[PDB]
Structure 1
């Protein structure tokens, strides 16, 4: 769960950012679904869910955790 997420964050996370309740994660083209799957499988209590595009993932924070808090957690896992 968390170990596979941690590994893929190091492999696939290009950058992180945030706005309100959202963490925005950027990946190489095509990698968003694969990294998002790993986040989903980790089932973090402070993550409501994720949605992946092609190179971008929106991670929705569970109140009171903020998007900036999740972005910094992800960032420091790279």
Structure 2
């Protein structure tokens, strides 16, 4: 779960950002659904859910974790 997510983050995470309870992950062109999917599958306790577009993922942080702390965690697995 977590090791698959980690590898794919290393492959596919271009950048991260945050606002409030939200991390925003940028990926290459066809890649966001695929990444989002590995995140969901990892089922992180600090994560409520994810929604992907083509090249963007919204990851919803579980309180009290913030979007910034979620995004920092994702950075440090890449």
TM-score of the superposition, structure 1-length normalised?
Answer: 0.99
- Are 2:51 and 1:51 aligned? yes
Consecutive aligned runs of 4 or more in structure 1 exceeding 3 Å deviation: none
* C-alpha distance in 2 between matches for 1:46 and 1:19: 16
Q: Which runs of 5+ in 2 are unaligned?
A: none
Report Cα offsets for 1:24-71 as digits up to 9, x if no partner: 000000100000000000000010000000000000000000000000
Question: Secondary structure of 2:25's partner?
Answer: strand
TM-score of the superposition, structure 2-length normalised?
Answer: 0.99
Q: Which residue of 1 aligns with 2:68?
A: 68
* C-alpha distance in 2 between matches for 1:65 and 1:55: 24
Q: Which runs of 5+ in 1 are unaligned?
A: none
Task: Kindly report the root-mean-square deviation, in angstroms, between the aligned alpha carbons of the 2 structures.
Answer: 0.4
